[PDB]
UniProtKB/Swiss-Prot annotation:
Subcellular compartments: Cytoplasm, Cytoskeleton; Nucleus; Mitochondrion
Protein's recorded name: Tyrosine-protein kinase ABL1
Modified residues annotated as Phosphotyrosine in this record: 12, 57
Tissue expression as described in the entry: Widely expressed.
Noted disease: Leukemia, chronic myeloid: A clonal myeloproliferative disorder of a pluripotent stem cell with a specific cytogenetic abnormality, the Philadelphia chromosome (Ph), involving myeloid, erythroid, megakaryocytic, B-lymphoid, and sometimes T-lymphoid cells, but not marrow fibroblasts. A chromosomal aberration involving ABL1 has been found in patients with chronic myeloid leukemia. Translocation t(9;22)(q34;q11) with BCR. The translocation produces a BCR-ABL found also in acute myeloid leukemia (AML) and acute lymphoblastic leukemia (ALL).
Organism: Homo sapiens
Membership in a protein family: Belongs to the protein kinase superfamily. Tyr protein kinase family. ABL subfamily.
Stretch of the intact protein here: 60 to 121 of 1130
Function: Non-receptor tyrosine-protein kinase that plays a role in many key processes linked to cell growth and survival such as cytoskeleton remodeling in response to extracellular stimuli, cell motility and adhesion, receptor endocytosis, autophagy, DNA damage response and apoptosis. Coordinates actin remodeling through tyrosine phosphorylation of proteins controlling cytoskeleton dynamics like WASF3 (involved in branch formation); ANXA1 (involved in membrane anchoring); DBN1, DBNL, CTTN, RAPH1 and ENAH (involved in signaling); or MAPT and PXN (microtubule-binding proteins).
Amino acid sequence: MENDPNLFVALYDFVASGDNTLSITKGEKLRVLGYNHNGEWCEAQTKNGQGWVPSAYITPVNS
């Protein structure tokens, strides 16, 4: 299916540290809204809130 280009899935569990990082779970869908300047951190929205998550733990859904 054709998904939103900013729809990502988590590759691993990530537990927030600590202020305005967002906690995520392996296989969870996320919507990425923004990047830091080199794209290694993502401002993401999930079923549980908004905040920062590492690119290394997520991947876009589309291919």
